[PDB]
Amino acid sequence: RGKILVSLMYSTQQGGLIVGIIRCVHLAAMDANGYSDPFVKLWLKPDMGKKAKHKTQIKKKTLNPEFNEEFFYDIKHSDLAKKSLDISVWDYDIGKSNDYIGGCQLGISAKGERLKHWYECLKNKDKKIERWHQLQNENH
């Protein structure tokens, strides 16, 4: 499936969270060429609206591209923790439909590892918290 580098960071000043989609590696190939067009979509829940979802630039013809996209969430730090960032990577296709490659969930409600990276973000607001996440298959 591959892994995607996610850089977190909360801006208390602005009163919101910051999601940074750096890059991905070891991504699957959707084309017969042995490559793919993976992109990353982010959605924090429970959310406040139906626009909490996102999608980084399309990394066409590549399994180990670099997004380097900095997002901005509108959630109160006090709620951040309880939040749950869903970073999913999907394959893109011109003239056709997309595809599910893999993703992961990031919410303080988690336990094991994601809580360490996510939660810490709440502690290291102004500080950038980045790390590599292992892509998983939820609903293919």
Extents of the domains making up the chain: 1-140
92 in a labelled binding site: yes
Rounded CA gap, 94 and 112, in Å? 38
Q: In angstroms, rounded to a whole number, what is the distance separating the alpha carbons of residues 62 and 33?
A: 10
- Tell me: is residue 99 an annotated ligand-binding position: yes
Q: How far apart are CA 87 and CA 55, in angstroms?
A: 9
Annotated ligand binding at 93? The verdict is: yes
CATH assignment, 1-140: 2.60.40.150
DSSP 78-113: HHHTT-EEEEEEEE--TTS--EEEEEEEEETT--SS
65: DSSP letter:
-
Radius of gyration of the chain (CA): 15
Q: Is 117 helix (H, G, I), strand (E, B) or coil?
A: helix
Give the integer Cα–Cα distance in Å for 109 and 139. 21
Please give the backbone phi and psi of residue 120, each rounded to the nearest 5 degrees, phi first: -45, -40
Q: Which residues contact 138 (CB under 8 A, 6 or more apart)?
A: 88, 100, 103
Is 74 assigned a ligand-binding role in the annotation? no
The technique by which this structure was obtained is NMR
